[PDB]
Amino acid sequence: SGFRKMAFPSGKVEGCMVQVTCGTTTLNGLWLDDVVYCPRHVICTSEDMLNPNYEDLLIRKSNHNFLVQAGNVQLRVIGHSMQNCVLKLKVDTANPKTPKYKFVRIQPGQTFSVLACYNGSPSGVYQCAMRPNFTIKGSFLNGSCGSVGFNIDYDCVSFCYMHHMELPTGVHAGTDLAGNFYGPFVDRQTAQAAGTDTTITVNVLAWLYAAVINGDRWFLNRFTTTLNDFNLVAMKYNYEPLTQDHVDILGPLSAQTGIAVLDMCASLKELLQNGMNGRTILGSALLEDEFTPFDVVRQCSGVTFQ
Amino acid sequence: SGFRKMAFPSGKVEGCMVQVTCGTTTLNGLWLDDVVYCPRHVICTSEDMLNPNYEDLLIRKSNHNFLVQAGNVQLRVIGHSMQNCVLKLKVDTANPKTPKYKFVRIQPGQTFSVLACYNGSPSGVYQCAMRPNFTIKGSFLNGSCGSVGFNIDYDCVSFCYMHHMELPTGVHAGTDLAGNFYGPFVDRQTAQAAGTDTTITVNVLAWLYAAVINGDRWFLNRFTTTLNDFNLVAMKYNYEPLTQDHVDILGPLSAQTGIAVLDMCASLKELLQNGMNGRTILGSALLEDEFTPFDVVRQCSGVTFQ
Numbered sequence: 001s002g003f004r005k006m007a008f009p010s011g012k013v014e015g016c017m018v019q020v021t022c023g024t025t026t027l028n029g030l031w032l033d034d035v036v037y038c039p040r041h042v043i044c045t046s047e048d049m050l051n052p053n054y055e056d057l058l059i060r061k062s063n064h065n066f067l068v069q070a071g072n073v074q075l076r077v078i079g080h081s082m083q084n085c086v087l088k089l090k091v092d093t094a095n096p097k098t099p100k101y102k103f104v105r106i107q108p109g110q111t112f113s114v115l116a117c118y119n120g121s122p123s124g125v126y127q128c129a130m131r132p133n134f135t136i137k138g139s140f141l142n143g144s145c146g147s148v149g150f151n152i153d154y155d156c157v158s159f160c161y162m163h164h165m166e167l168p169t170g171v172h173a174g175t176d177l178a179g180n181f182y183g184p185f186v187d188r189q190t191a192q193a194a195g196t197d198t199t200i201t202v203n204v205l206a207w208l209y210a211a212v213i214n215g216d217r218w219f220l221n222r223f224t225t226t227l228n229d230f231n232l233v234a235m236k237y238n239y240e241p242l243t244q245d246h247v248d249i250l251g252p253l254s255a256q257t258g259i260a261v262l263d264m265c266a267s268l269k270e271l272l273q274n275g276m277n278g279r280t281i282l283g284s285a286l287l288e289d290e291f292t293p294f295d296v297v298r299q300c301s302g303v304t305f306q
Numbered sequence: 307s308g309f310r311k312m313a314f315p316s317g318k319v320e321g322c323m324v325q326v327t328c329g330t331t332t333l334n335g336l337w338l339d340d341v342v343y344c345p346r347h348v349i350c351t352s353e354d355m356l357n358p359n360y361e362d363l364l365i366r367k368s369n370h371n372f373l374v375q376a377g378n379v380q381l382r383v384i385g386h387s388m389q390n391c392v393l394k395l396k397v398d399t400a401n402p403k404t405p406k407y408k409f410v411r412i413q414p415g416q417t418f419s420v421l422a423c424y425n426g427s428p429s430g431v432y433q434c435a436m437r438p439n440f441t442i443k444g445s446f447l448n449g450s451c452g453s454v455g456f457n458i459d460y461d462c463v464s465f466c467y468m469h470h471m472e473l474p475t476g477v478h479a480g481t482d483l484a485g486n487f488y489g490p491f492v493d494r495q496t497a498q499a500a501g502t503d504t505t506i507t508v509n510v511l512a513w514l515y516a517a518v519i520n521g522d523r524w525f526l527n528r529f530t531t532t533l534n535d536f537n538l539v540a541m542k543y544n545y546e547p548l549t550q551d552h553v554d555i556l557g558p559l560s561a562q563t564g565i566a567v568l569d570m571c572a573s574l575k576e577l578l579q580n581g582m583n584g585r586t587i588l589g590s591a592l593l594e595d596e597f598t599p600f601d602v603v604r605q606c607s608g609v610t611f612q
């Protein structure tokens with residue numbers, strides 16, 4: 001038992017991390033087979049960065065301008081091309097550590113592990129959710145761009161995120177690995193705001209089920225509610241609506257605990273209207289929404305990866 | 307910016323994880339050079355486990371009784387010996403993936419990363435503190451014993467924890483890698499309780515400094531207090547005493563933020579007497595105590611590891 005914010009083992013991704021230097025800019029790249037993927041703003045300098053034209057900037061570049069640095073071994077760039085907001089640097093060596101992988105784009109509400117990197121070297125690993133407003137609440141400093149987010153499914157690494165920027169509120173924005181931003185953000189230094197967020201209702205319910213699985217039961221009650229009556233309460237508290245598909249996804253957790261989904265909703269409703277009265281749930285004094293139903297089943301059941 | 311509970315990249319440890327099977331018991335082992343380390347209770351069966359005599363049980367064992375399983379390659383055991391509560395299985399192959407390492411024992415209040423494993427396969431990674439009562443609030447299921455906790459210092463892995471058991475309150479107990487338990491626990495199925503815990507005061511103050519570094523300032527105040535006057539408040543709230551050495555360790559964070567340590571203590575004092583009044587700090591509605599001063603500097607500065 002116990003419930004922790006758990007990231008995937010990072011080893012498969014650590015073997016893909018390289019350093020990319022162009023001009024005065026150093027950032028991280030992702031080396032899969034004979035390609036290194038990195039944010040296109042590596043080709044920029046501090047005054048290019050107010051409003052760049054990256055197509056113009058890239059035709060001005062040479063292969064030899066890109067210093068790719070894999071640990072203490074330099075990789076020769078033999079070609080380059082831009083795909084949306086990422087660069088693809090073709091190198092003369094395939095990465096012998098390339099895992100099975102996929103480039104997948106995730107949905108707000110879904111979680112992933114981030115391997116924070118500086119100078120091509122991994123710094124730490126942590127779990128993040130894609131917020132409903134397409135930001136992520138990460139931990140990123142100068143030089144962390146090109147760090148990636150990912151899930152692992154048995155032996156296959158599904159890359160879903162490359163880091164590009166921090167918004168003024170201290171949240172983070174980036175692209176999928178095809179270079180397409182999550183949300184209405186651009187890789188320019190202009191006035192960009194996150195947009196109003198909401199709480200991921202289905203995840204809160206998942207975490208309440210994790211709590212019950214772990215012996216926290218004080219918030220349970222005999223009441224119930226309809227899906228429509230719950231959603232009127234969700235609106236008032238800036239929780240996102242709960243759909244019948246969300247109810248379906250929560251079925252397994254409902255069955256393991258014996259608590260109907262709509263009964264748990266009645267418990268959430270009372271937690272929203274009353275607060276927690278000085279008590280905690282799974283060591284938190286807040287309703288946590290960055291655990292998916294999958295994350296709960298995975299942790300509370302013991303799935304591994306090879 | 308941002309502040310997350312961050313674990314170390316786990317790759318160096320993943321390459322050391324193996325499966326150890328003896329009789330009906332399967333657990334995890336740690337393969338460094340030509341030795342596999344695992345909990346000694348692998349030699350037990352369900353009725354041995356009420357009150358074992360492990361010396362008696364071990365002399366009854368043969369090398370060939372130990373199936374060591376490194377991925378899909380079997381390791382031949384050529385010797386065995388017990389060191390306190392761990393077994394040392396001598397194998398005929400040195401692990402080619404052995405990192406630089408050390409066996410270190412940590413202090414309550416100190417943090418480490420846990421690579422949770424089942425059947426020799428890594429499941430997830432997360433950050434834990436050693437509580438003042440020598441337990442850890444982890445996430446562990448049947449088969450997770452032999453998972454290890456660790457820190458990484460540049461390229462060197464300091465192993466500090468091997469998992470052995472769960473207490474009735476849902477917290478976890480284990481040994482250092484020399485097989486010596488943290489706290490007053492034994493690897494027997496008898497009535498064992500954790501003992502009353504306290505809050506790690508110096509860590510809370512570190513996390514308040516992380517908050518300030520990240521723009522959370524609402525809890526700051528113009529008041530100050532003496533170390534003795536603060537410690538009278540700490541006692542009443544079951545916070546552990548703050549020493550001058552703790553003040554010294556918090557010096558760098560004090561200097562970066564311009565907030566004297568004792569001024570932050572005055573802020574903690576008011577948070578303890580008043581609560582947070584519906585507000586949050588770094589996304590938490592509780593005072594967090596599982597970040598050391600080092601963890602804060604590491605994250606808020608960007609240290610990596612090779």
Ligand SMILES: *[C@H](O)[C@H](C[C@@H]1CCNC1=O)NC(=O)[C@H](CC(C)(C)C)NC(=O)c1cc2c(OC)cccc2[nH]1
Pocket residue numbers: 027041044049140141142143144145146164165166167168172186187188189190307
């Ligand atoms: C790449 O390593 C870096 C990562 C951020 C630095 C600090 N935290 C980060 O996550 N990305 C980066 O510096 C962006 C460069 C591009 C070209 C994408 C704009 N810049 C920003 O994130 C950025 C710039 C600004 C400005 O302008 C000064 C104002 C407010 C926020 C902001 N974010």
Ligand SMILES: *[C@H](O)[C@H](C[C@@H]1CCNC1=O)NC(=O)[C@H](CC(C)(C)C)NC(=O)c1cc2c(OC)cccc2[nH]1
Pocket residue numbers: 001333347350355446447448449450451452470471472473474478492493494495496
């Ligand atoms: C090893 O994989 C296992 C890990 C725990 C299983 C569930 N969560 C864990 O962290 N360790 C294990 O099963 C212990 C075996 C020894 C030989 C060390 C006792 N057993 C326990 O952790 C254990 C046994 C009990 C009992 O007795 C039934 C009562 C309360 C708590 C408890 N913990």
